[PDB]
Amino acid sequence: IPLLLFRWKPLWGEGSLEPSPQSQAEDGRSQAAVGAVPEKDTALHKSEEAVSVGQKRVLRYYLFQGQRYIWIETQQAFYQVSLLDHGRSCDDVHRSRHGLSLQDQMVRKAIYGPNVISIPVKSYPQLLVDEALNPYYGFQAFSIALWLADHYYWYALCIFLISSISICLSLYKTRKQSQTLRDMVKLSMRVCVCRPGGEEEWVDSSELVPGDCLVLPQEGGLMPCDAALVAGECMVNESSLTGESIPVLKTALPEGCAETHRRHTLFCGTLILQARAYVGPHVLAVVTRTGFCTAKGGLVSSILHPRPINFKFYKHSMKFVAALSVLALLGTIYSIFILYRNRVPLNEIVIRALDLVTVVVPPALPAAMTVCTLYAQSRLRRQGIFCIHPLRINLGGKLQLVCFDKTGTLTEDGLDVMGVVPLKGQAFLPLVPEPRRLPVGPLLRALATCHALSRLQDTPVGDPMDLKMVESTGPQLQVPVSVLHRFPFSSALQRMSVVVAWPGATQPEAYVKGSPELVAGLCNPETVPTDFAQMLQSYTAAGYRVVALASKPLPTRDTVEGDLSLLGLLVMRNLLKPQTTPVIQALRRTRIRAVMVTGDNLQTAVTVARGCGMVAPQEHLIIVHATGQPASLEFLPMESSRHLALSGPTFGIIVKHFPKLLPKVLVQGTVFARMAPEQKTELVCELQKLQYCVGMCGDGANDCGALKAADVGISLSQAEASVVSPFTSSMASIECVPMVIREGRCSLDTSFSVFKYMALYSLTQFISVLILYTINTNLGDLQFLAIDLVITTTVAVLMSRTGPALVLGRVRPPGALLSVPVLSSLLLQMVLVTGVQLGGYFLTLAQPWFVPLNRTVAAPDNLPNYENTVVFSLSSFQYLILAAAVSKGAPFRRPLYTNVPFLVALALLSSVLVGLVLVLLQGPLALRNITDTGFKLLLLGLVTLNFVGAFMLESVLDQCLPACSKKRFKQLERELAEQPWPP
Ligand SMILES: Nc1ncnc2c1ncn2[C@@H]1O[C@H](COP(=O)(O)OP(=O)(O)O)[C@@H](O)[C@H]1O
Numbered sequence: 001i002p003l004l005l006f007r008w009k010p011l012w013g014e015g016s017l018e019p020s021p022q023s024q025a026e027d028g029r030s031q032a033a034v035g036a037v038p039e040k041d042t043a044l045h046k047s048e049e050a051v052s053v054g055q056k057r058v059l060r061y062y063l064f065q066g067q068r069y070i071w072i073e074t075q076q077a078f079y080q081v082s083l084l085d086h087g088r089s090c091d092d093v094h095r096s097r098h099g100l101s102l103q104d105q106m107v108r109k110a111i112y113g114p115n116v117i118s119i120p121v122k123s124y125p126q127l128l129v130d131e132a133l134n135p136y137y138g139f140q141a142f143s144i145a146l147w148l149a150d151h152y153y154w155y156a157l158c159i160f161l162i163s164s165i166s167i168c169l170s171l172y173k174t175r176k177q178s179q180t181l182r183d184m185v186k187l188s189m190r191v192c193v194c195r196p197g198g199e200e201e202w203v204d205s206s207e208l209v210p211g212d213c214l215v216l217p218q219e220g221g222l223m224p225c226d227a228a229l230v231a232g233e234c235m236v237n238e239s240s241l242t243g244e245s246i247p248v249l250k251t252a253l254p255e256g257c258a259e260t261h262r263r264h265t266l267f268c269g270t271l272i273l274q275a276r277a278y279v280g281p282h283v284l285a286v287v288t289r290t291g292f293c294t295a296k297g298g299l300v301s302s303i304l305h306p307r308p309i310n311f312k313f314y315k316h317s318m319k320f321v322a323a324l325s326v327l328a329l330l331g332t333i334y335s336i337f338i339l340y341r342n343r344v345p346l347n348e349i350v351i352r353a354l355d356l357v358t359v360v361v362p363p364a365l366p367a368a369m370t371v372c373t374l375y376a377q378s379r380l381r382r383q384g385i386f387c388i389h390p391l392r393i394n395l396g397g398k399l400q401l402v403c404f405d406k407t408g409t410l411t412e413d414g415l416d417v418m419g420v421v422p423l424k425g426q427a428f429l430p431l432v433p434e435p436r437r438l439p440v441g442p443l444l445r446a447l448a449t450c451h452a453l454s455r456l457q458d459t460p461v462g463d464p465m466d467l468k469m470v471e472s473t474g475p476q477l478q479v480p481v482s483v484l485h486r487f488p489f490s491s492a493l494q495r496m497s498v499v500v501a502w503p504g505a506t507q508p509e510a511y512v513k514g515s516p517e518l519v520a521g522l523c524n525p526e527t528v529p530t531d532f533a534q535m536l537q538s539y540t541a542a543g544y545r546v547v548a549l550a551s552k553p554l555p556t557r558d559t560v561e562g563d564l565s566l567l568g569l570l571v572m573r574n575l576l577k578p579q580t581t582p583v584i585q586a587l588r589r590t591r592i593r594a595v596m597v598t599g600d601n602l603q604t605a606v607t608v609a610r611g612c613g614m615v616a617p618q619e620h621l622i623i624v625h626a627t628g629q630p631a632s633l634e635f636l637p638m639e640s641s642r643h644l645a646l647s648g649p650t651f652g653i654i655v656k657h658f659p660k661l662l663p664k665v666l667v668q669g670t671v672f673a674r675m676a677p678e679q680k681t682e683l684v685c686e687l688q689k690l691q692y693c694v695g696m697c698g699d700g701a702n703d704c705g706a707l708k709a710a711d712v713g714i715s716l717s718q719a720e721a722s723v724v725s726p727f728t729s730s731m732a733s734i735e736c737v738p739m740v741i742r743e744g745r746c747s748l749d750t751s752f753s754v755f756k757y758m759a760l761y762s763l764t765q766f767i768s769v770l771i772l773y774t775i776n777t778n779l780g781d782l783q784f785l786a787i788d789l790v791i792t793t794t795v796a797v798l799m800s801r802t803g804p805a806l807v808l809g810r811v812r813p814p815g816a817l818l819s820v821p822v823l824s825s826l827l828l829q830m831v832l833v834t835g836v837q838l839g840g841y842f843l844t845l846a847q848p849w850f851v852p853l854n855r856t857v858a859a860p861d862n863l864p865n866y867e868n869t870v871v872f873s874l875s876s877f878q879y880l881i882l883a884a885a886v887s888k889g890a891p892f893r894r895p896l897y898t899n900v901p902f903l904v905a906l907a908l909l910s911s912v913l914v915g916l917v918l919v920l921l922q923g924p925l926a927l928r929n930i931t932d933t934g935f936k937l938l939l940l941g942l943v944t945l946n947f948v949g950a951f952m953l954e955s956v957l958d959q960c961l962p963a964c965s966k967k968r969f970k971q972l973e974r975e976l977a978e979q980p981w982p983p
């Protein structure tokens with residue numbers, strides 16, 4: 001020890017590297033280290049090695065963002081604990097069916113931990129110190145001490161009381177955010193395990209390690225651990241990790257690993273429904289990942305350690321500070337040079353000149369910007385839209401592009417069958433609209449057994465496609481029996497296989513059900529006829545939902561899928577929602593681009609993108625359809641502002657073999673079809689590299705990678721807020737997509753209003769003291785208190801309560817404070833402010849009842865003079881004129897009379913402040929009460945010259961047209977104008 005710099009820290013974290021290198025020795029040999037600093041580039045993080053309790057061997061671990069890193073003496077490095085058993089063979093978990101004994105469970109627990117999502121409950125002394133130990137409140141405690149020196153008790157009290165409001169609002173924001181995360185990871189539950197010889201023992205869910213076995217109750221419940229199913233079957237509701245409320249099917253793990261075997265894994269938190277065994281006495285699961293290593297542990301660990309959003313946090317910090325410093329120092333050296341000309345004794349010139357740098361730092365600035373964000377999150381919640389991080393609400397007003405998923409999002413999630421189109425030897429015999437009429441053969445057993453719905457509590461429950469084609473024929477559900485669901489439906493492979501058998505068969509048959517251009521590629525080519533592309537387009541370009549069916553007899557693996565015989569097409573109808581078409585046309589009107597992103601068929605997705613309005617009539621679009629070979633694009637025009645339509649594999653050829661042709665497609669492509677759930681994610685990440693600000697409105701599991709990758713992701717038709725998306729709407733409509741844009745624009749406008757107000761606020765009171773430091777007549781105590789506490793804090797907390805508009809328009813919020821329409825406002829609003837203070841001061845000098853002030857006493861001591869009363873009365877109205885001037889909401893917010901507490905406060909404070917002029921309270925506030933003539937009515941006729949002169953000045957400045965591209969996409973669009981890309 002003896003290297004601590006605590007003796008030099010009591011006489012003063014700007015540079016973390018220049019401070020930790022002196023408080024601790026720069027020592028190598030991390031086997032014998034105690035603290036580790038964790039970054040090459042980026043920001044620094046100092047981590048403490050933990051409190052190792054390993055008796056047999058020393059254990060050196062440390063938490064870092066929940067992720068334990070472990071020390072290994074045979075490699076001499078810090079490897080991640082999640083990495084440990086990575087690469088484990090598929091037969092090892094089947095040798096792990098008996099679990100772990102108590103001699104090996106305790107060893108495991110130390111390495112992995114208690115399997116708990118660690119949301120720490122911060123105490124109020126631990127949380128007041130986390131907020132008050134900041135430079136800003138360090139300057140506000142310097143301000144409480146500096147005024148107290150001059151005996152301004154009242155002024156000092158409100159610097160404490162405003163900062164106590166500012167602290168307690170940041171302790172409401174933080175404590176309620178962490179209570180939201182803590183209420184969705186609470187999984188205390190009794191769990192039965194198996195030991196090496198016949199034990200259950202009823203262990204707790206916070207006592208589980210990887211490698212341990214786990215039996216599952218028939219009734220089901222939340223999944224405590226990220227297990228792996230080895231023996232049995234179960235139906236899982238994965239709405240807490242994906243978004244689909246439909247149950248999925250979980251096949252047991254074969255013999256031969258968490259993302260590949262996605263249909264074999266029971267993720268943590270997702271509820272299980274039936275959990276049948278069918279092989280032994282009970283159903284077995286083997287634990288793979290625990291608390292911060294699992295998914296729902298890695299989603300929470302990305303919530304509370306987020307990524308920087310791609311928007312400037314108010315654009316300029318340093319530039320604004322520099323401007324303030326030049327502006328506020330030129331008013332500071334003025335009071336140096338003027339108070340010396342008024343012959344101050346130079347002891348009080350250092351306490352007066354340090355009071356001008358105090359008034360330009362308003363104490364209510366973090367409180368006014370906190371409620372600007374709490375009001376925004378509270379307005380979305382009443383409209384049904386939820387939120388986790390309210391720092392992305394301001395990204396809603398910057399959306400230049402929104403991507404949508406077609407089925408269940410633009411269209412209705414429910415289906416209705418139209419009838420099968422059978423096949424009898426390359427024929428396409430015509431459609432059977434009631435499929436309980438065609439005879440018992442391979443096709444009638446196909447659509448009655450190739451499903452995954454389950455008999456659960458008096459109603460069948462499953463996929464909305466599978467619920468309809470079984471209802472289309474109407475058999476009972478528990479004569480053909482299902483041997484094994486050989487392949488559950490995955491969205492990336494676009495098919496589903498079921499092996500069936502029935503009494504009276506020589507051999508079982510193997511049915512399939514998938515997308516028509518993928519099954520017909522798979523089937524024996526001597527069965528699919530020559531007009532399959534024409535018989536498909538006759539249905540799928542009328543707006544129908546078509547899947548195919550095929551069979552093969554079996555005399556397991558995926559030998560089932562291949563050398564099939566095509567049975568028939570199943571045709572379903574998918575109608576748009578009633579709310580889809582006005583929303584897409586509202587986005588197209590306001591120059592926000594809308595993009596179809598779906599996994600469904602191409603000709604179906606084009607006839608949906610016309611019926612709702614991605615492509616208006618008399619607008620040409622081109623289907624590209626690159627070949628699977630590395631040849632060209634071939635362009636097939638569609639006849640029914642260029643648009644483009646792509647297939648899934650077409651987007652794969654262009655991103656891998658035409659890399660310079662890819663930006664010309666993304667600036668004008670509107671329909672993307674047959675997209676894999678990892679190709680949707682790739683499209684969002686490729687659009688953001690063109691410097692778009694993309695949105696994403698989706699539904700279900702295939703959109704999960706795209707919702708995370710987007711700047712704004714919205715998930716539909718869910719309760720409270722899921723971990724999956726930043727914004728989780730619960731409306732089952734896309735009309736929550738303009739609500740986020742419209743709330744996002746007003747919050748980006750009511751934040752720049754509070755910025756302009758506190759700038760116009762500080763400056764007004766700064767000049768109102770500069771007029772009173774000359775003539776040695778500084779402002780009162782209670783007057784200062786009223787100006788800072790009663791007037792200004794009321795019209796800044798209530799200022800941002802207004803609400804967003806009702807109709808979007810094609811104008812964006814400016815996104816930059818220091819610009820020429822804003823500095824021309826702040827210059828010309830303040831030329832006026834000084835004109836009606838100096839002009840109201842030089843006019844009271846020329847009155848016959850006027851006596852000057854006794855200059856040779858002091859500044860605060862014995863002066864209730866006339867020079868204070870004619871300035872305080874004419875300055876206290878400036879804070880209500882400017883509170884309603886910058887609160888303009890005609891393009892973005894609303895007119896301010898809708899905000900009822902911002903009318904009642906702004907009229908009661910404009911009525912008391914008349915009673916301090918005409919009718920007084922002059923004991924307090926030290927007002928010169930001897931004014932008895934009709935000079936009162938001349939000052940009120942000068943306030944009205946400001947109540948009109950400020951509203952009628954910004955209306956001129958809004959009509960400012962200066963007569964005197966950076967974004968990549970804009971450049972491409974210009975190039976496209978000159979030369980069209982498709983021809
Ligand atoms: N339950 C199912 N069984 C078999 N095939 C399906 C099922 N659901 C969808 N498909 C087919 O798989 C393809 C891709 O699936 P998916 O991406 O989930 O489609 P969607 O965008 O309509 O949700 C679709 O063209 C659809 O025809």
Ligand SMILES: [Mg+2]
Nearest residue numbers: 407408491700
């Ligand atoms: Mg689907």
Ligand SMILES: [Mg+2]
Nearest residue numbers: 407408699700
């Ligand atoms: Mg969907």
